[PDB]
C-alpha cells in the first residue's frame, strides 16, 4: 500500500573532520590554511536523493569562532559550474550568516531542493573577514574552488587554477529527507577507505564504487556516507582524531546510520617505525580498541562488519612496513576472522592480496606503492562486499 508519508533525514554525503593544525611529536607547527572575503566552492556525490537537503558546517578544530558569511547550494554541472535555476540559500534558524564557536558544529535548516542518487552538488561558502580554518577534510579526491568575493550564487568560480583545492573546508555532512525505508553504510576507516589514489574527481573510492554495485542492483535507497580520514589510527591522534576518540561523532552519531564498515588499523601498525617511535602499540591494544567500538555499535542496534588489514609488503619496508607491523597484522587478521561479536568479516586482505604472495597486495591492484589500492584495487574491494549484508 501506500508508504506512511512521515518524512526523515539521511545522511547522504559525510566528511571526517581534522585539524589541520595537528602534528605529530617532536614535529614542527603546521599553518591552518585561511579565508579572506573568499568564497569556496565544494563538488560532493549524493548518495541517497529525496525532496529536501540541509549541510552540516563545523569549526570543530578551530581556535576562535568562524563566521560564514553565505552558504549556499546548487546542482553541479561539471567543474565548477552550477545549475544556477536550482541555486538556493542555505539558512541557520533563518539566518544566512552564522557564527561557530572554536569546537561546535551546526546542521542547516532544511532547503527545498529536490536531488537524486549518484547526482553531484555544489555547496558554496563565503567568508566576509579573515577567517582561519584549520577544520577541514584534507584529502577530498575532490577539487574545490576558490575565488575573491561572494561566489556562491554565481554559475562558475571566477579565479587562478592554481587556487584550487582537493579538501572540504568546514563541509561534514549533507543529509536528505525521504519518505522511503533507508539504509545508511557508514564506512569507517584510514586512507584506503578515504580513497588515496583513485581519481580525483570520478567518484572512484571503494564506497563510491559499493554505492554503484548497490544502486544497479536496485537498492536506491541503501545509502553509503565515507567516514576515511587518509592516515588514520585507533589508537593515537594524527592524522586525524584517534579512531577510538572520532567513533562516536563519526559512526554512531551519523544521521539514519544502520551499518557499519571498520577498515583501520594498518596506520597504527606501520607509524611506530620511523613517523612516531614513541607511538609503538601492539596488537592487542588495536583489538582492544576495535572491540570497545565494536560493543558501542552493536548496543545502538548497528550491523557492525570489520574488514581485514590488506596486505602491504613492500611499503616503505623498513620504514613503515616491517617484520614487527606484519605479526601484528596477521594477528589482528585472525582476531577478526574468528570473531562472534561482529555480523560479519569483510576479507579485504584475501580479495587484494597477490596470488603470488599473499604478504603483497595483487600488482593489478596496487597503485604502485604496495600500500593504498588503484581504482581496480577500489573496485575490487567493493565487488568482495555481500550485498544481502547490507539489508
Ligand atoms: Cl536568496
Ligand atoms: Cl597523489
Ligand atoms: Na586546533
Ligand atoms: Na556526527
Do not use: C
Amino acid at each position: 500500500g501506500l508508504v506512511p508519508r512521515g518524512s526523515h533525514m539521511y545522511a547522504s554525503w559525510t566528511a571526517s573532520m581534522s585539524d589541520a593544525t595537528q602534528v605529530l611529536p617532536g614535529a614542527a607547527p603546521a599553518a591552518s590554511q585561511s579565508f579572506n572575503n573568499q568564497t569556496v566552492r565544494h563538488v560532493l556525490r549524493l548518495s541517497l536523493g529525496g525532496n529536501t537537503l540541509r549541510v552540516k558546517v563545523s569549526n570543530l578544530f578551530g581556535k576562535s569562532p568562524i563566521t560564514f558569511t553565505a552558504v549556499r547550494v546548487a546542482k553541479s554541472t561539471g567543474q565548477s559550474n552550477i545549475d544556477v535555476s536550482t541555486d538556493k540559500s542555505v539558512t541557520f534558524n533563518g539566518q544566512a550568516s552564522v557564527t561557530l564557536e572554536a569546537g561546535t558544529e551546526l546542521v542547516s535548516d532544511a532547503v527545498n531542493l529536490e536531488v537524486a542518487p549518484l547526482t553531484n552538488i555544489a555547496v558554496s561558502m563565503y567568508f566576509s573577514s579573515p577567517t582561519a580554518m584549520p577544520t577541514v577534510h584534507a584529502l577530498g579526491v575532490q577539487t574545490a574552488f576558490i575565488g575573491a568575493g561572494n561566489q556562491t550564487a554565481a554559475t562558475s568560480i571566477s579565479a587562478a587554477a592554481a587556487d584550487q583545492s582537493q579538501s572540504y573546508y568546514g563541509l561534514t555532512a549533507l543529509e536528505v529527507s525521504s519518505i522511503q525505508k533507508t539504509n545508511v553504510v557508514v564506512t569507517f576507516g584510514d586512507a584506503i577507505t578515504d580513497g588515496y589514489k583513485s581519481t580525483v574527481d570520478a567518484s572512484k573510492r571503494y564506497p563510491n564504487q559499493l554505492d554503484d554495485r548497490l544502486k544497479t542492483a536496485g537498492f536506491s535507497r541503501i545509502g553509503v556516507v565515507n567516514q576515511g580520514i587518509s592516515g588514520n589510527r585507533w589508537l593515537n591522534d594524527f592524522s586525524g582524531p584517534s579512531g577510538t576518540s572520532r567513533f562516536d561523532r563519526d559512526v554512531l552519531n551519523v544521521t539514519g546510520i544502520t551499518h557499519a564498515i571498520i577498515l583501520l588499523g594498518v596506520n597504527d601498525l606501520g607509524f611506530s617505525a620511523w613517523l612516531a617511535p614513541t607511538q609503538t602499540v601492539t596488537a592487542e591494544q588495536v583489538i582492544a580498541a576495535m572491540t570497545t567500538a565494536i560493543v558501542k555499535a552493536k548496543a545502538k542496534g548497528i550491523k557492525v562488519f570489520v574488514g581485514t588489514i590488506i596486505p602491504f609488503k613492500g611499503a616503505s619496508m623498513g620504514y613503515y612496513y616491517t617484520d614487527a607491523a606484519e605479526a601484528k597484522r596477521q594477528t589482528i587478521n585472525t582476531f577478526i576472522r574468528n570473531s562472534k561479536e561482529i555480523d560479519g568479516v569483510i576479507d579485504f586482505a584475501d580479495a587484494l592480496k597477490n596470488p603470488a604472495d599473499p604478504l603483497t597486495i595483487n600488482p593489478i591492484y596496487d597503485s604502485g606503492d604496495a600500500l593504498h589500492p588503484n581504482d581496480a584495487g577500489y573496485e575490487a574491494m567493493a565487488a568482495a562486499i555481500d550485498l544481502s549484508k547490507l539489508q
